[PDB]
Design a protein around this ligand. Structure first.
Ligand code: PRO
Ligand code: PRO
Ligand code: MN
Ligand code: MN
Ligand code: NA
Ligand code: NA
Ligand code: OH
Ligand code: OH
Lengths: 484, 482
């Protein structure tokens, strides 16, 4: 069948990938007691947008549920799926003649049918007529709450939909659950996004020089990803934190826009991941700006390397993800004590939630169509009300087919450290004489993308990780490393 | 005073630029007989957004009127200007403690006051209280219609604004008119955006090889602009049309995403412009993919070079922009006749609107903080309902301080050609046997950015333009990323 491809050495993605997602969704819905015969799933694609009130077009990126079901790159579409038969119909915009002048060829419906390997193609303005002719029992539309943003998914609507029976409660948890479990075809794409982003991270490590602006490496990363990988988008805004900025978890946004000059002695924390055909990657590399770890940098870095590898070694089906977070916390505390930053009983440190001072974010999250992927907190799964753990984006147990980021880190964040020092329950663990040395250090984060398998995990990411490997890469020796 | 700067060799932009814009706006408003004493201009800045229902942040780019007045890069702000005194107050978000963990330093109000060189800074949640104490007659807010998008400008609103008298009609025409005329400080930024984008176009011409994907050059262009120019954004989505795609005017969008392989014998039409601190550039270069113009390519290319230079040579204060568009049409028709594509009276061709078959878009437009800048069709300036001219984004007369793109082109667009061939009023001019050879040629566009001066224009763009210059540039043996 047909494939999405951007030529050169980019990945051919079979449109069969999306056909399989539609089949899986129907199979799940048919087993749902709330679903009656003759139901039709109705999804609305994203539309073109502009900057504010201007005619400056914003580059269109498809809505993630719609992409998952159809793989369609054009704005203004709808898509429906007959649950009982699996029959898929794509609705495409009926374009004005002038489109041919300004935007390009006005493709036929048959062109789109062949391109996307759907069963039928119709024009958007015909959706009420076409659905009326099929005499559905109920239309199943998308509405639910994203547990990372708090936003409500946009339910499909069209002229005449009020004449149909519409249910907007059934679909969301079911299509979310399908997205949680990646197919082998989806894993092929995520292997590829990790391949290209890993290569780009290695090029950045080779290119980094003291005196550069952070954004020079953002630019280089995205250029590798696009020109070599066909990744027109990143999965999220690049985080290129040097020096103290490496303690800022989502550094690089408009308010802190990767605009610091990299200094000798700084640590760098570069959290970047290209997106290919709306599939994510998320990789974080930490390294010394000048290519040589100091003793202090090595100690903090290897503490996080230890927790990274311990978690990857422990992950397998049945493991409760919050237990992996607590494992990372315990290892960070052990290593911070071994460094002289902390002293006393590590058991007592754990009981006092001291780990969250140094890692105030969740250990990792689902990854897929969205970098913070859906389904972390389905009904019944509760957020843990403790420091650090409350920021986990899932409290689920691991099962084969899930894709997770594993992103432990240690940071020196002044207001968190100062809170701890003001707190009798935590203050005694801290050795200020040693800690003062790490004020303004920033932090280290080491992030891998992995698949949960029957036997453990498959590591997708391929970047240098030991001190020796990283120093070699920065010296231009990027291939001299061996993944976990 | 303070300046915006992204280090290295990037441009230092004084915040005085925005203070001058605020002064100019107040001066204009004070002369408006409808404006009451004690009026306060109230603008609302852009807010952070995400992709659909996800938590995937979209990189924030400031709303253009707000940027013009304040130069503020942070989301979630408001800004007000006392019309009578010119006093400026910026309102910034009161951030939660956790911002320091996730997003960065929680700057003081004093930090923002010094950064932006405004008269005062307050928190957004105090805007009603602050405005109340100033006892304004009327709040002047922004509402009007953009004549390129047809969208309505988003009017400022805040909790408690209902307690004020608000006028949303006066401001828009006045702040639009101010934006039409660029200050010397604004022109310095537009010289810089043209400089970097010109350099990036030259690098692309040197890098193009047969067999590359169009998007490889989009990527290279944006990388040059960001890494060397500090241009995090482009002014618009890059248009990298090779072969027949060079006839597609806004090629490169998600539906036609710069994904063709460049072939031997193709013409390339690359329309790209980096954005610096929300100031635009817009440059188009046309050239043969293989570095050597054929006879047919040279003829079409030099026709557009001729109209480009003729229009630039005629531009000066008082010139009616639609007359320049018609000048370009007449030149294109003359040249297409010399080539043998057309035969007959060029006068009669013009009367039949044949020029619009080959150039269906407007000759050019205002450029500034938006690439299609505001103010092309103020009240009293009408759109001309004729082929080609109806797509002009302004029908104004030129005045000093206006910044315009000059972008003639000739394209071979099947459905326009087919219409013309069916129409007896136009078909007689077209020589089918010659035209057939140019089906699938694509097109040529040559686009310069210029400023109207007291006596003529100033050219901002600097790329190779003659056939000799282009061939020498592409044969050049500087920018090696990895
Ligand atoms: O938002 C999150 O969950 C991770 C934590 C470090 C940066 N991104
Ligand atoms: O939209 C416009 O006015 C110009 C025409 C060529 C492409 N951009
Ligand atoms: Mn990340
Ligand atoms: Mn242009
Ligand atoms: Na190096
Ligand atoms: Na900029
Ligand atoms: O991350
Ligand atoms: O253009």
């Amino acid at each position: 069948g047909p494939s999405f491809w951007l030529g050169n050495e980019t990945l051919k993605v079979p449109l069969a990938l999306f056909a399989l997602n539609r089949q899986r969704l129907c199979e799940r819905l048919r087993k749902n007691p709330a679903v009656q015969a003759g139901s039709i799933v109705v999804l609305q694609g994203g539309e073109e947008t502009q900057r504010y009130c201007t005619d400056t077009g914003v580059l269109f990126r498809q809505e993630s549920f719609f992409h998952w079901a159809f793989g369609v790159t054009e704005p203004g579409c709808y898509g429906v799926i007959d649950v009982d038969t699996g029959k898929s119909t794509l609705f495409v915009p009926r374009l004005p003649a002038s489109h041919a002048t300004w935007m390009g060829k006005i493709h036929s419906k048959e062109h789109f049918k062949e391109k996307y390997a759907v069963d039928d193609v119709q024009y958007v303005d015909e959706i009420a007529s076409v659905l009326t002719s099929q005499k559905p029992s109920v239309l199943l539309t998308l509405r639910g709450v994203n547990t990372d943003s708090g936003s409500v998914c946009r339910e499909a609507s069209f002229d005449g939909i009020s004449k149909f029976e519409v249910n907007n409660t059934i679909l969301h948890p079911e299509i979310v659950e399908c997205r949680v479990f990646k197919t082998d075809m989806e894993l092929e794409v995520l292997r590829y996004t990790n391949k290209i982003s890993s290569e780009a991270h290695r090029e950045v490590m080779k290119a980094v020089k003291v005196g550069m602006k952070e954004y020079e490496l953002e630019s280089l990363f995205e250029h590798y990803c696009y020109s070599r990988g066909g990744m027109r988008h990143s999965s999220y805004t690049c985080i290129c934190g040097s020096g103290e900025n490496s303690a800022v978890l989502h550094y690089g946004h408009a308010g802190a826009p990767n605009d610091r000059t990299i200094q000798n002695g700084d640590m760098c924390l570069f959290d970047m991941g290209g997106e290919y055909y709306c599939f994510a990657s998320d990789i974080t590399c930490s390294f010394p700006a000048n290519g040589k770890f100091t003793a202090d940098q090595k100690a903090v870095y290897e503490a996080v390397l230890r927790s990274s590898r311990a978690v990857m070694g422990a992950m397998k089906p049945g493991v409760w993800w919050p237990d992996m977070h607590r494992l990372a916390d315990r290892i960070h505390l052990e290593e911070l004590a071994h460094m002289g930053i902390l002293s006393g009983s590590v058991d007592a440190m754990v009981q006092a939630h001291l780990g969250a001072v140094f890692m105030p974010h969740g250990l990792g999250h689902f990854l897929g169509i969205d970098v913070h992927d859906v389904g972390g907190y389905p009904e019944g799964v509760e957020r843990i009300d403790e420091p650090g753990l409350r920021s986990l984006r899932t409290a689920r147990h691991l099962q084969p087919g899930m894709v997770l980021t594993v992103k432990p880190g240690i940071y020196f964040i002044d207001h968190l450290l100062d809170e701890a020092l003001a707190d009798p329950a935590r203050a005694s663990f801290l050795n200020r004489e040693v800690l003062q040395r790490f004020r303004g250090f920033g932090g280290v984060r080491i992030e891998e993308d992995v698949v949960v398998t029957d036997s453990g995990i498959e590591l997708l990411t391929c970047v240098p990780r030991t001190v020796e490997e990283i120093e070699a890469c920065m010296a231009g020796c990027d291939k001299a490393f061996t993944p976990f």
